Amino acid sequence: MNLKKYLSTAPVVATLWLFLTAGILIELNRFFPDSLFY
Amino acid sequence: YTIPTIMVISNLVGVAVGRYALGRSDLTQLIASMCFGHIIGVGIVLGLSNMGVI
Amino acid sequence: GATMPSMPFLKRPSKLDGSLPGGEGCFDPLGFTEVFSLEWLREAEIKHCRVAMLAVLGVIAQEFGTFDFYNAKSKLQLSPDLHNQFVQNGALQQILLFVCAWEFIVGLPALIESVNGNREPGYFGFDPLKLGGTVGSAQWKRMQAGELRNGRLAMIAFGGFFHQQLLTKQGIIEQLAHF
Amino acid sequence: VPFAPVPEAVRESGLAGSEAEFDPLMITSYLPISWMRESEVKHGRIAMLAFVGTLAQQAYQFPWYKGAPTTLVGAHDHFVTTALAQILLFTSAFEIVAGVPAAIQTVRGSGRLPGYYGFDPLGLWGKDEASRKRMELAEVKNGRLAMIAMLALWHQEVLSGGMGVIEQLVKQKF
Amino acid sequence: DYIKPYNNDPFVGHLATPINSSSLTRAYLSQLPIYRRGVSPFLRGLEIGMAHGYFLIGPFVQLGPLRNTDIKYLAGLLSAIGLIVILTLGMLLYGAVSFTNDSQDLESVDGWRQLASGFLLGAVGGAGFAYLLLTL
Amino acid sequence: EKQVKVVVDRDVVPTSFEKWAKPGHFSRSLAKGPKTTTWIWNLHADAHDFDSHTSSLEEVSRKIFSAHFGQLAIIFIWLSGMYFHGARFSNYVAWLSNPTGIKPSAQVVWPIVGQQILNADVGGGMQGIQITSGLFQLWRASGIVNELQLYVTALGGLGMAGLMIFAGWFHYHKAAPKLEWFQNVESMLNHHLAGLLGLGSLSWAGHQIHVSLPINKLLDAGVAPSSIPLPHEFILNRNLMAELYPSFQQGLVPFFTLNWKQYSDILTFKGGLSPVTGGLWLTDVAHHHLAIAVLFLVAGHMYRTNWGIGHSIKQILEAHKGPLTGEGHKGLYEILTTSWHANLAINLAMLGSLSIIVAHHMYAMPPYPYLATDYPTQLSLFTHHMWIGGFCIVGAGAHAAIYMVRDYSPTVNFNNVLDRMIRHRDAIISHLNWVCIFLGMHSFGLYIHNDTMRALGRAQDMFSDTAIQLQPVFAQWIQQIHTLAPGNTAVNALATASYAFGADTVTVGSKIAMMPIKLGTADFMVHHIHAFTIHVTTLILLKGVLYARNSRLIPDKANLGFRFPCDGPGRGGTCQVSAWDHVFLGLFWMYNALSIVIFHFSWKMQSDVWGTVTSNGAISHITGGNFAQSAITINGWLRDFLWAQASQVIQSYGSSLSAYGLMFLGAHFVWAFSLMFLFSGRGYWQELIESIVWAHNKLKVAPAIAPRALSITQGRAVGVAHYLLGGIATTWAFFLARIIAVG
Ligand code: CLA
Ligand code: CLA
Ligand code: CLA
Ligand code: CLA
Ligand code: CLA
Ligand code: CLA
Ligand code: CLA
Ligand SMILES: CCCCCCCCCCCCCCCC(=O)OC[C@H](COP(=O)(O)OC[C@@H](O)CO)OC(=O)CCCCCCCCCCCCCCC
Ligand SMILES: CC1=C(/C=C/C(C)=C\C=C\C(C)=C\C=C\C=C(C)\C=C/C=C(C)/C=C/C2=C(C)CCCC2(C)C)C(C)(C)CCC1
Ligand SMILES: CC(C)[C@H](C)/C=C/[C@H](C)[C@H]1CC[C@@H]2C3=CC=C4C[C@@H](O)CC[C@]4(C)[C@@H]3CC[C@@]21C
C-alpha cells in the first residue's frame, strides 16, 4: 500500500504540476487582467 | 362468460401441447403450459373481440 | 433454533466484530464491516457521535441565548434562513475555515494512522480532567461506551430536531411547551 | 401415500413444521423448504394480526381518527396517506434491517428455524422439545385459518357493499 | 455437399458450385460462339461481332449527345462503328504480342487475326442491321 | 441438463496500492523497466487488452465484468453531471414557460480571459452556451417541471455511480465469479430480454402513464409548470387521473378482464405528431413501451435455464444445416462462449447499427416535445448518433479480425459457415470489389458528368429533373404506400407513422416540424453515393477479417499477430498488410461515408424540411429548394453547401458563436497535423531524434529513457486519430454554428 510512490509517478506529478501552473496563470489573469507590456 | 370459457379451453390446449412437447408431467411443465395457454387465450379473446364476435 | 453462532439480534451469525467498547450489540444486520475496514467505520461513527452531540446541545442552547450581537432574525436554529444569514455574516464561514483546517491538518493524519492500525479510532488523547482514568482500563472502556451511546442518541435526536422544526416551524422548547 | 391420496409422496416429511404432508403440487421439490416455511409463517402472523385488527377497528375506534371509515377498502384508502404510509415505512424498515437478510441467510445454509426471532418475552414457547414442537405447529395451525379468514372477510365486505363482519353476520347472508 | 473442388481434386484455386458448374451452366457456357466445337475463328468472330454491335448501337443512339436531333440514329451508328474499330485495334494488339507463329487454333497470330477480322465484320454488320431496324 | 448456479471466489485479489507504483505490472515485458520511450506508449496500448495479460479465460472474464462496472459508474457520473448542470446552471424553468422562444442552455462560462462573451443571450434571464443535446426536451417529456427534481435526479445518479464503483471493486477483490459463470448465455439472454429490456420498458411505460402523460397533458393545455400537481399527487389522488383520463375510473379491473379496449384514453395509436409540440403523442409512446415490454418479456422465456422448459442455443445452431452449408452453424456456440472478442464484434456491429437506426427514426419522428422546432438539437442528435454508430461498426470489424487472428480454432471451425466462408474468401472479396467499382462509377461518375455538362453549358444533357431524370421510383413508391397505410393497412392507426413519408406538414411556433421529404434525382444520386461508400468501407473491413489469418502474399499472418507493422520490403512490399491496418484504412472510409451521410441530412433538411411558415401557410426554407438543382453537382456541393453555409462559422467572431469559429480553425490544424503522421515514416524521425539526442549529449542533459520515434503501427494510429478528430471537429463546429446562427 505505497500510495505515495504512485502519486509520485510521471502522469500524476505532471498533471498536478501543470494544474498548479495553469491555476497560477488563471488567478494572475483575473486579478491582473489584460496584462500587456508589463 | 365467453371469456372465461375461451381462457379455460386455451389453458387445456396449452396443457396438451406442453405435455406433448416436454414429454413430462410436473409442476414446471404445468406452469409453462399454463403460461403458453394464457398467451394463446389472451390473444384469441382480444382478436375475437376486435372482430365483434365477442 | 438459530444458527451455531449468535448475535444480540438472537437470530444472526456473529460477524467479525466481537466485544468492543460500546459494541456489545454487534449491530451489523447489513454487511458493512465485511467489505469496509472496521477502523474506518469506527472513526466515522465516533466523529459523527461527537459532532452530533455538539449539534444537539447547540440547538437547545441557541434557543435560550443568541449573545445579543448576532442579528438572529429567525428564532429557529435549524432553519435554512438562520444558516444562510450566519454564513453571510461570516460566523459560519469562520467555523468552516477552522473546522476544515483541523480536518486536513489533523483529522486526515488521524484517520490514516487509525486505518494503518496504530491509533485507536476516535482517540485524540484529549483528557484535560482525569475523568476517564487510565487508557484501556476501568473508567475508560465504560466511558468510551457511554460516549458511543450518547452520540448515537444525539444523532437520532438531531435528526428528530431538524424534522420536527421543519414540519412545525416551532423550536424544540417551543414545541415541547405547546403541542 | 401422503394425506392427499392422488398425489405421490410429497417429500418434506422428515423435516419440521407439520406431520401432515400436504404439498400436492410438490412446490417444495422446486423451492427451498425453509424459504417457503418462512413466507408461510410470515403470512400467518400478518393475517392473524389483520383479522384481529378487522374485528377490533369495526367495533371501536380510537379518540383520534374519530371520523374515518371502518371498511377495509375505505379504511385503506382513507389512511393510505398518513397512517398506513407511516405503518408501511416502519414495517418496511423492519424488513430491510431484520427481514430480508434473515431469509437470505436461512436459504444460504443457516440453521435458523423458519420464522424464528428472539421475540419470546414471556417464555410461552415451552421447555420440553415436544411442547415447543406442538407450540410451533399450533402457531402455523392457527395460521392458514386467518389467511383464509382474511380472504373471506375481504370478499364478504366487497360483495356486501362495505358491511362489517359482525354487522354482516347480524343483517344478511348471501 | 453441393460445393466441391472444381476437378474433384482439392488444393485447386476453384470450387464447383451450382452456377459455377452445372448441367445448365455447362451447356450454356458451351455452344457459345467461343468454346463451341467445330467452329473456325472467323465464324466465331463474325457471330460475336454481330451480337456485340447490335447492342452497342443502342446506348449511343438513345443517350448520345445528338439523341434529340434528326440524325440521332446515324450519329449513334457512327459512334458504335468507331468504338468497334477501337475494340478491333485492341484485339489485334493483344494477338500481336500474346501469340506467336503456330497452327491456326485461335491461340496463334493467324487465328486471332481471323477472329479479329470476323469480330469487326460482324460488329459493323450488326450495328448496320440495328440501325436499319430503328429507321424502319 | 446443466445447473445454472452461481459460484464465486472470495478475496481472490487483494486491495492494495502496491501494484499502483509499478506501471506495466500487468505485462511481463513492461514490468522489466522502460529502457526506451516506446515503453510509455506500449503501457497504454496494452492496458485494456486483458487477453494479452493472462492466458486464462476466467481472469479475463473477471477483468471485463469489472471495468464494465467502472464504465457504468463513469456513465452515471456523466448523467449526474448533466442533471446537476440543468438544475444549477440552466434556464430550464424559463424554457418550460416559453419553449419556442427560449434557447436551451446549461453551461455558464467563467469571466477570465474575455471568454464571458460565449454566454449567449439564450433568454430566460441567464446567459450561457446553447446546448444542442436535447436535455431540455428529454426532461420535459419525462415530466420534470422544477429544478428540485433535477437536483434529486443528479444526487441519485451520483449514488448509482458509487454503487457501480463498489460493485466493480467487489466483483474483483471480494467475490469474483468463476468461468462457469459468464458462460451461461441462456440465462444471461433470458434476464437481459425480460429484465434489463422487458422490465425496463415496462417500468418506463408505467412512469409515462403515471407521470409523463398527465404532466405533459396539463402543460399542453396552457397550465403553468408551477401550478401543475406534483407527480406523486396523480398517484395518491386517483380523482385527478380520472379527470384527465376517464379510463382510470375503471382502474386495473379492465386489464385483468381482458377489456383492454377501455384503455383508449391512455393507450392510443394515433400515429402522428402532436400539433401543439410537434412530437409524438405521449399516449402512443406509452402504449409502444407497454407493447415492447410485453413482447420482450415473452421473448425472455425462450432459452432453457435450470429447468426442463426452454431452448438450447447450441441445439438450435446445430439444427440449422443445409446442402450449401455442410455443417451449418455447428461450433458457433463454443465460439461465442470461449472468446469475448467474437461477442464484442457481434455486439459492436449491432450496437452501431442500432445507433444509426436511432438517428434516422429520431429525426423523422421527433419523439420528444419541441424537439423538431429546435433544429440545432435535431441536427446535433442525428449527426451524433450517426457518428457513434459508424465508430461502433468499425470497432465491430476490428474485433472480428482480432478474434480471427487470436481466438480462431480449425477444429471448432470445421466445414461450418465460418470455415466455408474462409475457403471462398477470394470470391467474396473479388465480387465485392467489383460491386464497389460499379457503385463508385455509377454514383460519383454521375456527379462528375453533371459537373462537366454544367461547365460546358450543356445543361440539357444532365442527370436532373429537367434533363435526364433518375427518379427513385421504388423509394417514392414506398413513401406513397406509407402515406396510404393509415387507412388500408393500419386500420387502427389514425395517421401515418412519419409525416416525412407524406400526409400533411406540421408547424409549431411558426416553424416547420415535419413535412414530406420528397425524393428526386439529387436524392437518387446521393443515396447511391451512400451505398457506394458503405460498400467500400465494408469491403475493407471484410477483407481485413477474412485474410486476418493468412493470404496468398503472407501465408502465416496469424503467427505475426493482429497488430504488426509489416513483413518487410519483400514480395514487392508488405506494408499495412495486418488486419489492424485494414481497420486503420476502414476508419478513413467510414469517416468519408459518414461525413457524406451527415452532409446529405444537413443540406436536405435545411433546404426541404427545416424552415419558417408565414401566416396563411406560406413556407420558406433556410435554403429555398436549392438542393434540387445544387446537390446534383460537386460544384454545387462546394458553393451552395460548403461555401454558402460556412459564412456563419467564419463570421462568428465577435459574438457568442466565436468559440465555434475558433474550434473550426483548431480542427483544421489538427486535421492538417494528422497528415504529418500519415505521409511520413519512423525511420526519418528516428534519425532526427538521433541528431537531437547528440545535441543533448553535448550538454550532459540526455535522458536515461532512450528517446525513440513512434512505432510504425503507433504512427499510423496517431495519424488516423488526428485525421478523424480534426475532420469530425470541423464538421461539428460547422454544423453547430450554421444551425445556431440561422434556424
Ligand atoms: C411496471 C409498470 C407499472 C407500475 C409500476 C404501475 C403502478 C401503479 N399503477 Mg399502473 N398501469 C400500467 C403500468 C404500471 N402501473 C399499465 C401498462 C397500465 C395500462 C395502461 C396501467 C394502468 C393503471 C390504472 C388504470 C391504474 C393504475 C394504478 C397504479 C397504482 C396502483 C395499482 C393498484 O394496485 O390499484 C388497484 C386497482 C384495482 C381496481 C384492483 C383490481 C381488482 C379490485 C380489487 C376489484 C374488486 C372491487 C373492489 C370493491 C374495488 C373497486 C374498484 C373500482 C371502483 C375501480 C400503482 C402505483 C391505479 C392508480 O392508483 O391510479 C393512480 C389505477 O387506477 N395503473
Ligand atoms: C491550483 C492553483 C491555484 C492558486 C495558486 C490559487 C490561488 C488563490 N485562489 Mg484559487 N482556485 C483554484 C486554484 C488556485 N487558486 C481552483 C482549481 C479553483 C476551483 C476552480 C479555485 C477557486 C477559487 C475561489 C472560489 C477563490 C479562489 C481564491 C484564491 C486566492 C485567495 C487567497 C489564497 O491564498 O488562497 C489560496 C487558494 C488556493 C491555493 C487554491 C485552493 C482552492 C480550494 C480547493 C478552494 C476552492 C473550493 C471550491 C469552491 C469548492 C471545492 C473545490 C474542489 C477542488 C475541492 C488566491 C491567491 C479566492 C479569491 O478570489 O481571492 C479573493 C476565491 O474566492 N480560488
Ligand atoms: C385464432 C384466433 C385469432 C383471431 C381471430 C385473431 C384476430 C386478429 N388478431 Mg390475433 N393472435 C392470436 C389469435 C387470433 N387473432 C393468437 C393465438 C396470438 C398469440 C400468438 C395472437 C397475437 C396477435 C398479435 C400480436 C396481434 C394480433 C392482431 C389481430 C388483429 C389483426 C391482425 C391482422 O389480421 O392484420 C394483419 C397484419 C399483417 C399482415 C402485417 C404482419 C406484421 C408486420 C409485417 C410486422 C412484422 C414484424 C417483424 C418482421 C417480425 C417480428 C420481429 C420480432 C423482433 C418481434 C385481428 C382482428 C393484431 C392486433 O393487435 O390487432 C389490432 C396484433 O398486433 N394477434
Ligand atoms: C460513370 C458515370 C457516368 C455515366 C453513367 C454516364 C452516362 C452518360 N454519359 Mg457521361 N461522363 C462521365 C461519366 C458518366 N457518364 C464522366 C466522368 C465524364 C467526364 C470525363 C463524362 C462526360 C460525358 C460527355 C462529354 C458526354 C457524356 C454523355 C453520356 C450519355 C451517353 C454516353 C454514351 O453514349 O456512352 C456509351 C455506352 C456504352 C457503349 C455501353 C454502356 C455499358 C452497357 C450499357 C452495360 C451493360 C451491362 C449488362 C447489364 C451486363 C449483363 C449482360 C449479360 C449477362 C448478357 C450517358 C447517359 C454524352 C451526353 O450527351 O450526355 C447525355 C456526352 O456527350 N458523358
Ligand atoms: C433481470 C436480471 C439482470 C439485469 C436487470 C441485468 C442488467 C445488466 N447486466 Mg447482467 N446478468 C444477469 C442478470 C441481469 N443483468 C445474470 C443472471 C447473469 C449471469 C448469467 C448476468 C451476467 C452479466 C454480465 C457478464 C454482464 C452483465 C451486464 C449487465 C448490464 C449491461 C450494461 C447496460 O446495458 O447498461 C444498463 C444499466 C442499467 C440500466 C442500470 C441498472 C443497474 C441495476 C443495478 C440493475 C442490475 C441488477 C443486477 C443484475 C442484480 C443485482 C444484484 C444484487 C445482489 C444487488 C446491465 C445493468 C454487463 C455489465 O455491464 O457488467 C457490469 C456484463 O458484463 N450481466
Ligand atoms: C465497447 C467498445 C469497445 C471496447 C470494449 C473495445 C476494447 C478493446 N479494443 Mg477496440 N475499438 C472500438 C471499440 C471498443 N474496443 C472502436 C469503436 C474502434 C474503432 C475506432 C476500435 C478499434 C480498435 C483497434 C484498432 C484496436 C482495439 C483494441 C482493443 C483492445 C485493447 C484496447 C487498448 O488497450 O488500447 C488502449 C486505448 C488507448 C491508448 C486510448 C486511445 C485514445 C484514442 C485516440 C481515442 C481518443 C478519443 C478522445 C475523444 C479524443 C479527444 C480528446 C483529446 C483532445 C485528449 C480492447 C479489448 C486493440 C487490440 O485489440 O489490441 C491488439 C486494437 O488494436 N480497438
Ligand atoms: C498542420 C500540419 C503540420 C504541422 C502543424 C506541422 C508541424 C511541424 N512539423 Mg510537419 N509535416 C506535415 C504537416 C505539419 N507539420 C506534413 C503533411 C508533412 C509531410 C509528411 C510534414 C513533414 C515534416 C517533416 C519531415 C518534419 C516536420 C517537422 C515539423 C515541426 C517543425 C518544427 C516546429 O515548427 O515546431 C513547432 C511546433 C509546432 C508548430 C506545433 C504547435 C505546438 C503544439 C500545438 C503545442 C503542444 C500541444 C498543446 C499543449 C495542445 C494539446 C493539448 C493536449 C491535452 C491534447 C513542427 C512541429 C520537422 C521537425 O521535426 O522539426 C524539428 C521535420 O523534420 N514535418
Ligand atoms: C434470389 C432471391 C433473393 C433476392 C436477393 C436479395 C436477397 C437478400 C439476401 C442476401 C443473400 C442473397 C440470397 C442468395 C443466397 C442464399 O440464400 O442462398 C441459399 C443458401 C442458404 O441455404 P442453405 O441450404 O445453406 O441453408 C442452411 C443454412 O442457411 C442454415 O440456416 O445460402 C448459401 O449457402 C449461399 C450464400 C450466398 C451465395 C452468394 C450470393 C451473394 C450475392 C449477394 C447479393 C445478393 C443480391 C443483392 C440484391 C440484388
Ligand atoms: C442480362 C439479361 C438478359 C439478357 C438477354 C439478351 C442480351 C438477349 C439477346 C440478344 C442479342 C444481344 C442479340 C443480338 C443480335 C443481332 C442479330 C440477331 C443480328 C443480325 C443479322 C444480320 C442482318 C447480319 C448482317 C451482316 C451484314 C450486314 C454483313 C456483315 C456480316 C453480318 C452477318 C453481321 C436476360 C433476359 C437473359 C436475363 C435478364 C437480363
Ligand atoms: C452493502 C450492504 C448493504 C450489503 C448488505 C453487504 C453485504 C456484505 C457484502 C456481506 C454480508 C453477508 C455476505 C457475506 C457473508 C459472509 C462474508 C465473509 C466475509 O469474508 C465477507 C464475505 C462474505 C462471504 C460475504 C460477502 C457478501 C455478504 C452479502
Task: Single out the residue of D41, D146, D46 nearest to residue D103, CA to CA.
Answer: D41
Question: F78 in contact with C at a CB cutoff of 8 Å?
Answer: no
Task: Single out the residue of F583, F543, F590 nearest to residue F563, CA to CA.
Answer: F583
SS3 label, residue C25: coil
By the 8 A CB rule, do F467 and F459 touch?
Answer: yes
Q: List, in order of start, the domains of chain D with CATH numbers.
A: 27-171 (1.10.3460.10)
Cα–Cα distances (Å) from A16 to A11, A12, D114, F18, F703, in that order, read: 8, 6, 58, 21, 22
Could you give the number of structural domains in chain B?
Answer: 1
- Check if F499 has its Cβ closer than 6 Å to any atom of ligand 5: no
- Resolution for this model in angstroms, one decimal place? 3.1
Chains F and E touch (3+ CB pairs under 8 A): yes
Residue whose CB lies within 8 A of the most ligand 10 atoms, among C4, C9, C27, C34, for a mutation test: C34
CB atoms within 10 A of CB E126: 24
Q: What's domain C38-177's superfamily in CATH?
A: Chlorophyll a/b binding protein domain (1.10.3460.10)
Residue of minimum CA distance from atom 55 in ligand 5: F167
Residue of minimum CA distance from atom 22 in ligand 10: C34
CA separation for the pair F478, F501 (Å, rounded): 8
CA separation for the pair F694, F469 (Å, rounded): 67
Contacts for E99-107 with beta carbons within 8 Å, 24 or more apart? E104/E41, E106/E41, E106/E44
Question: D6 in contact with B at a CB cutoff of 8 Å?
Answer: no
Q: Which residue is listed with cell 401415500?
A: D1
- Find how far residue F167's CA is from the centre of its chain: 27
By the 8 A CB rule, do F511 and F612 touch?
Answer: yes
CA separation for the pair C143, C132 (Å, rounded): 6
CA separation for the pair F513, F373 (Å, rounded): 6
CA separation for the pair D1, D23 (Å, rounded): 12
SS3 label, residue F128: strand
Question: C35 in contact with F at a CB cutoff of 8 Å?
Answer: yes
CA separation for the pair C176, C178 (Å, rounded): 6
CA separation for the pair F633, F13 (Å, rounded): 63
Q: Do E1 and F423 touch (CB under 8 A)?
A: no
Exposed (0-12), middle (13-18) or buried (19+): which is C100, by Cβ within 10 Å?
Answer: exposed
Exposed (0-12), middle (13-18) or buried (19+): which is C168, by Cβ within 10 Å?
Answer: middle
Cα–Cα distances (Å) from C139 to C131, C135, C143, C147, in that order, read: 8, 9, 6, 12
Looking at C67-178, which runs of residues are DSSP E strands? none
Task: Single out the residue of F701, F651, F710, F653 nearest to residue F676, CA to CA.
Answer: F710
Beta partners for residue F612, in sequence order: F511, F620
Determine the straight-line distance between the first and last CA of chain E, rounded to whole angstroms.
Answer: 54
Q: Do F298 and B49 touch (CB under 8 A)?
A: no
Question: For residue F569, how far is its CA from the centre of ligand 7 (angstroms)?
Answer: 28
C12 is in an annotated binding site: no
Beta partners for residue F120, in sequence order: F128
CA separation for the pair D10, D28 (Å, rounded): 8
DSSP secondary structure letter of residue F722: H
By the 8 A CB rule, do F567 and F554 touch?
Answer: yes
- Check if A28 has its Cβ closer than 6 Å to any atom of ligand 2: no
Question: For residue E57, how far is its CA from the centre of ligand 9 (angstroms)?
Answer: 11
CA separation for the pair F314, E71 (Å, rounded): 69
**Phi–psi pair at E113, nearest 5 degrees:** -70, -45
Sequence-distant (≥ 6) Cβ neighbours of residue B19 within 8 angstroms:
B25, B29, B33
| Cα radius of gyration (chain E) | 19
- Tell me the one-letter amino acid at F52: S
The two beta strands, F105-107 and F611-613, are: unpaired
SS3 label, residue A8: coil
The b-or-e profile of C101-131 (16+ CB within 10 A means b, else e) is eeeeeebeebbebbeeeebbbbeeeeeeeee
The residue extents of the domains of chain C are 38-177
Closest chain C CA to residue F170: C35
DSSP secondary structure letter of residue F246: T
- Tell me the one-letter amino acid at D36: M
- Check if F322 has its Cβ closer than 6 Å to any atom of ligand 8: yes
By the 8 A CB rule, do E105 and E111 touch?
Answer: yes
Give start and end residues of each alpha helix (H) in chain E. Answer: 23-29, 41-63, 72-98, 109-135
DSSP secondary structure letter of residue F322: B
Helix F340-364 with F375-406: angle, nearest 10 deg: 160
Beta-carbon-side half-sphere exposure of residue F395 (alpha carbons within 13 Å): 15
**Phi–psi pair at E16, nearest 5 degrees:** -90, 80
Chains B and C touch (3+ CB pairs under 8 A): no
DSSP secondary structure letter of residue F13: S
Q: Which residue is listed with cell 452497342?
A: E56
By the 8 A CB rule, do F190 and F305 touch?
Answer: yes
- Tell me the one-letter amino acid at F31: A
> How close does chain F come to B9, measured CA to CA in Å?
16
Q: Do D25 and B27 touch (CB under 8 A)?
A: yes
SS3 label, residue F107: strand
By the 8 A CB rule, do F122 and F91 touch?
Answer: yes
- Check if A27 has its Cβ closer than 6 Å to any atom of ligand 2: yes
Q: Which residue is listed with cell 414557460?
A: F97
What is the number of CB-based contacts under 8 A between chain A and chain F? Answer: 24
Cα–Cα distances (Å) from F403 to C61, F106, F544, F698, in that order, read: 71, 43, 12, 49
Task: Single out the residue of F313, F312, F330 nearest to residue F321, CA to CA.
Answer: F330
Q: Do F258 and B45 touch (CB under 8 A)?
A: yes
Please, what is the Cα angle at E80 between E74 and E81, to 5 degrees? 90
CA separation for the pair F151, F157 (Å, rounded): 10
- Tell me the one-letter amino acid at D79: F
CA separation for the pair F102, F108 (Å, rounded): 16
C39 is in an annotated binding site: no
C-alpha dihedral over D92, D96, D99, D105, to 10 degrees? 160
CA separation for the pair F330, F312 (Å, rounded): 13
Residue whose CB lies within 8 A of the most ligand 9 atoms, among E19, E24, E50, for a mutation test: E50
Cell of F366: 421527433
Sequence-distant (≥ 6) Cβ neighbours of residue F508 within 8 angstroms:
F100, F275, F276, F277, F278, F370, F372, F373
CA separation for the pair F362, D108 (Å, rounded): 48
Q: Do F326 and E1 touch (CB under 8 A)?
A: yes
CA separation for the pair F378, F362 (Å, rounded): 8
Beta partners for residue F322, in sequence order: F325
* CB within 8 Å of chain D, chain B residues 1-54: 26-28, 30
Cell of A10: 510521471
Question: For residue A15, how far is its CA from the centre of ligand 2 (angstroms)?
Answer: 17
> Residue F323 is nearest to which of E1, E15, E68, comparing CB atoms?
E1
CA separation for the pair F612, F22 (Å, rounded): 62
Question: For residue F552, how far is its CA from the centre of ligand 8 (angstroms)?
Answer: 27
Give the domain range for residue B2.
1-54
Task: Single out the residue of F261, F259, F260, F283 nearest to residue F270, CA to CA.
Answer: F283
Residue of minimum CA distance from atom 2 in ligand 2: A23
- Check if F665 has its Cβ closer than 6 Å to any atom of ligand 7: no
Question: D26 in contact with B at a CB cutoff of 8 Å?
Answer: yes
> How close does chain F come to B12, measured CA to CA in Å?
18
Is the dihedral angle over the CA atoms E123, E128, E131, E133 positive or is it negative? negative
CA separation for the pair F213, F290 (Å, rounded): 14
Ligand closest to E87 (CA) is: 4
SS3 label, residue F508: strand
Sequence-distant (≥ 6) Cβ neighbours of residue C175 within 8 angstroms:
C164, C165, C168
Is the dihedral angle over the CA atoms F98, F104, F109, F113 positive or is it negative? negative
> How close does chain C come to F214, measured CA to CA in Å?
29
Chains that touch C (3 or more CB pairs under 8 A): D, F
Task: Single out the residue of F508, F568, F2 nearest to residue F276, CA to CA.
Answer: F508
Beta partners for residue F566, in sequence order: F575
By the 8 A CB rule, do F270 and F283 touch?
Answer: yes
Q: Method of determination?
A: cryo-EM
- Find how far residue C37's CA is from the centre of its chain: 19
Task: Single out the residue of B36, B33, B45, B35 nearest to residue B7, CA to CA.
Answer: B45
Q: Which residues line ligand 9 (CB under 6 A)?
A: E 50-51, 54-55, 121-122, 125-126, 128-129
Chains A and B touch (3+ CB pairs under 8 A): no
CA separation for the pair D94, D100 (Å, rounded): 9
SS3 label, residue F468: strand
CA separation for the pair A9, F179 (Å, rounded): 35
By the 8 A CB rule, do F483 and F503 touch?
Answer: yes
Beta-carbon-side half-sphere exposure of residue F489 (alpha carbons within 13 Å): 8
Q: Which residues line ligand 6 (CB under 6 A)?
A: F 44-49, 348, 391-392, 394-395, 398, 402, 562-563, 580, 583, 721, 725
Cell of E80: 458504335
Q: Do B22 and F308 touch (CB under 8 A)?
A: yes
Exposed (0-12), middle (13-18) or buried (19+): which is F451, by Cβ within 10 Å?
Answer: middle
Q: Which residue is listed with cell 513483413?
A: F567
Task: Single out the residue of F441, F610, F605, F594 nearest to residue F523, CA to CA.
Answer: F605
> How close does chain A come to F113, measured CA to CA in Å?
7
Is the dihedral angle over the CA atoms E66, E69, E71, E74 positive or is it negative? positive
SS3 label, residue F613: strand
Give start and end residues of each alpha helix (H) in F275-339. Answer: 282-299, 313-319, 332-338
DSSP secondary structure letter of residue F120: B
Helix D72-79 with D83-94: angle, nearest 10 deg: 90
C119 is in an annotated binding site: no
> How close does chain B come to F486, measured CA to CA in Å?
17
CA separation for the pair C116, F655 (Å, rounded): 56
DSSP secondary structure letter of residue F461: G
Sequence-distant (≥ 6) Cβ neighbours of residue F742 within 8 angstroms:
F622, F648
H/E element holding C160?
helix C141-168
- Tell me the one-letter amino acid at F460: Q
Please, what is the Cα angle at D165 between D164 and D168, to 5 degrees? 75
By the 8 A CB rule, do B30 and B39 touch?
Answer: no
**Phi–psi pair at F131, nearest 5 degrees:** -95, 135
By the 8 A CB rule, do F313 and F332 touch?
Answer: no
Cell of F670: 489538427
Percentage helix, strand, coil for chain C under 3-state DSSP, each rounded to 5: 55, 0, 45
Question: F173 in contact with C at a CB cutoff of 8 Å?
Answer: no
CA separation for the pair E131, E84 (Å, rounded): 15
SS3 label, residue D100: helix
Q: Which residue is listed with cell 415535419?
A: F514
Chains that touch F (3 or more CB pairs under 8 A): A, B, C, E
